[PDB]
């Protein structure tokens, strides 16, 4: 059988007729249908137009703030899956991105740090409880350490403590603890001072909390479980990164399959740019928007620049969606000058106008973007609805 | 049923079943149903072709059927009729609404009929006709330099001004579907060889091409995304990568 497919504007209307006879409407698929989304695109651009502006480094870890909650927040809107799934991933993608050049002190950089790490879909929560001495809890006592996890640690302790407590109940005063370097020495003026095959598995856990390297990759199970460790108990440089993360990758390999592993490791390599291709996949709405901050923080109408790419490119998705009230998004996003007015002018025309409001908005552009072709038409569709007026009051 | 269309907006549609006469849908602004607007018989032969006109004059469709002719309506009730074909017609599209209002048309015989309806009193449904010559084809237009491609047995040509000016290498079967990229600017063919291709076209040709027997291509207003249908029994949407090879965003199928 011959199929056949013909286009837009969506809005979730595409046709498919084929061959017997029947008429088939279809969606583009995980073609977000406006929702709250709606919303939350505004809300980024918004952010957007806040920023037309030492200083600038301030502004834009601020902005990071606006756009990161704008889509902690979305993302809520919408638990309450799949575009669920795929958002949760760029979150954490994008929550990294800021641990990483957008807090450049010592305080809020760790808690970056952790929640980036842990609010990333990670729950040993089952596995806790099917876990409760031996081998399995080692393993675990460590991976909890390592992932910051700390109260959590102490609390999965409390299991057979009882029976040389004079330095595990010293231990947790100095877990419960955490300058910080002053820590560091507490924490190995007891690992040295310091009965059987369990008496060993203690040693090493003195070791991953003091930061033993060749240790926070014996009980780390993942590539960013060690990543972090080190960070938080070796020693917290930035300057290190790149040592820290080629380390981790020769333990354990990375997972291709969760598309959101490998991004965070090209943000930790420098290599930026091998993040947005990726994103766009996701939600091709924060890609752009990310690539944006990227570029703040740092006749040819493409490859004028990357990231004025993903702009230009989203605002024509909006432009075949319908929502009246995006348009102030694509156009206001949109603004070489002359090549604009000539995107513009082919763009307007296909404007959902209703309210006198919504044609009052479009001459205002047709004013500063100098359209006249684009108004005087108008003119004669409000001119013949009221004609249409005029000749039913008179009836 | 060989074609569907759709409006400038995107609300109504026009359909010519395989039962001679061409029906029309509209959606509810309030629940989303396809509702008909009118429904009646035109010409005899199974209508092949459809197209809407542009509102920068009203509302009107162009009809072409193999009785030889290609008919103008207006709401809806027929307004001019086109007999000058001695062939069947296969493809009909009016010209984009920049140049303002005339048609072309592509059928059995041979001859490449540009009808242009004009005159100063702007309103005048009297069209007269600029022909000029080179079983399945079809025809696209292009919208901005008066440009419109062409589509025979297992050949594509692009005429301009009635000038040749360009050809489409590659096709080793029977085309069947041309679409002119909205914009450089850029074509699409649902060729019969089974495969698609992407062609750039500049102020020469390239190709980017991609692989059962495709049968319809389409593009959206922007984003500009490729549609292959074909016997595989599925839809197919494309997109532009960041140096202008297309890929595959995601497949309907209809198993």
């Known amino acids: 059988m011959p199929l056949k497919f013909k286009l837009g504007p969506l809005s979730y209307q595409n046709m498919a007729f084929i061959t017997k006879y029947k008429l088939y409407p279809v969606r583009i698929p995980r073609l977000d249908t ?53 958002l949760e991933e760029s979150l954490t993608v994008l929550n990294c991105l800021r641990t990483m050049y957008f807090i450049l002190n010592r305080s809020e950089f760790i808690e970056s740090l952790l929640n980036w790490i842990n609010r990333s879909d990670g729950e040993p929560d089952e596995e806790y409880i099917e876990q409760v001495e031996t081998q399995y809890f080692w393993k675990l006592l460590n991976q909890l350490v390592l992932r910051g996890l700390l109260s959590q640690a102490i609390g999965c302790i409390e299991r057979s403590d009882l029976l040389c407590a004079v330095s595990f109940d010293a231990v947790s005063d100095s877990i419960e603890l955490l300058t910080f370097r002053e ?52 020693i917290p440089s930035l300057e290190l990164s790149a040592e820290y993360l080629q380390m981790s990758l020769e333990a354990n390999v990375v997972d291709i399959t969760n598309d959101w592993e490998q991004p965070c490791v090209d943000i930790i390599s420098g290599k930026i740019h091998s993040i947005l291709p990726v994103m766009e996949s996701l939600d091709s709405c924060t890609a752009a928007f990310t690539a944006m901050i990227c570029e703040a923080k740092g006749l040819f109408s493409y490859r004028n620049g990357m990231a004025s790419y993903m702009l230009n490119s989203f605002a024509f998705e909006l432009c075949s969606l319908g929502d009246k009230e995006l348009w102030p998004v694509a156009i206001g996003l949109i603004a070489t000058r002359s090549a604009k007015k000539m995107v513009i002018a082919e763009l307007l025309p296909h404007y959902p106008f209703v309210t006198n409001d919504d044609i009052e908005w479009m001459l205002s552009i047709c004013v500063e973007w100098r359209l006249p072709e684009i108004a005087k038409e108008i003119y004669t569709t409000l001119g013949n609805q009221m004609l249409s007026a005029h000749n039913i009051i008179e009836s | 049923v060989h074609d569907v269309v759709y409006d400038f907006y995107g609300r109504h549609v026009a359909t010519c079943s395989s039962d001679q006469h061409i029906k029309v849908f509209k959606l509810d602004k309030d629940t989303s149903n396809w509702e008909l607007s009118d429904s009646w018989r035109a010409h005899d032969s199974s209508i092949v072709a459809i197209d809407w ?83 399945d084809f079809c025809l696209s237009w292009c919208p901005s330099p008066e440009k419109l491609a062409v589509s025979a047995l297992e050949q594509a040509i692009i005429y301009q ?39 750039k076209i500049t ?44 890929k595959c965003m995601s497949v309907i199928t209809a198993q």
């Open chain 2, 161 to 199: 001004r009635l000038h040749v000016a360009a050809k489409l290498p590659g096709h080793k079967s029977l085309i069947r579907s041309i679409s002119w990229a909205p914009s450089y600017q850029l074509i699409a063919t649902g060729c019969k060889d089974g495969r698609i291709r992407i062609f």
């Open chain 1, 34 to 86: 406006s929702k709250e989304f709606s919303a939350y695109v505004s809300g980024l651009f918004e952010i957007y137009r806040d920023l037309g502006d030492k200083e600038h480094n301030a502004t834009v870890n601020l902005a990071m703030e606006a756009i990161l909650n704008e889509l902690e927040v979305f993302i809520g809107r919408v638990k309450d899956v799949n575009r669920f799934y795929e």
């Open chain 1, 183 to 234: 820590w560091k020495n507490l924490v190995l003026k007891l690992s040295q001072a310091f009965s059987g095959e369990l008496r060993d598995y203690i040693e090493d856990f003195l070791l991953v909390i003091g930061g033993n390297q060749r240790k926070i990759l014996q009980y780390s199970r993942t590539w960013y479980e060690s990543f972090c460790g080190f960070l938080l108990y070796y």
């Open chain 2, 53 to 135: 006109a542009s509102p920068e004059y009203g509302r009107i469709i162009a009809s072409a059927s193999y009785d030889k002719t290609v008919k103008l309506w207006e709401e809806w009730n027929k307004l001019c009729t086109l007999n000058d074909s001695k062939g069947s017609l296969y493809s009909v599209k009016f010209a984009p609404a920049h140049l303002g209002l005339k048609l072309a048309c592509l059928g059995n015989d041979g001859i490449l009929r540009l009808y242009d309806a004009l005159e100063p009193s702007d309103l005048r449904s009297w069209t007269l006709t600029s022909e000029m010559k080179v079983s």
């Open chain 2, 203 to 246: 102020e020469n040709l390239q190709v980017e091409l991609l692989s059962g027997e495709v049968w319809s291509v389409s593009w959206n207003l922007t984003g500009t995304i490729l549609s292959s249908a074909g016997d595989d029994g599925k839809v197919r949407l494309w997109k532009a990568t960041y140096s202008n090879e297309f």
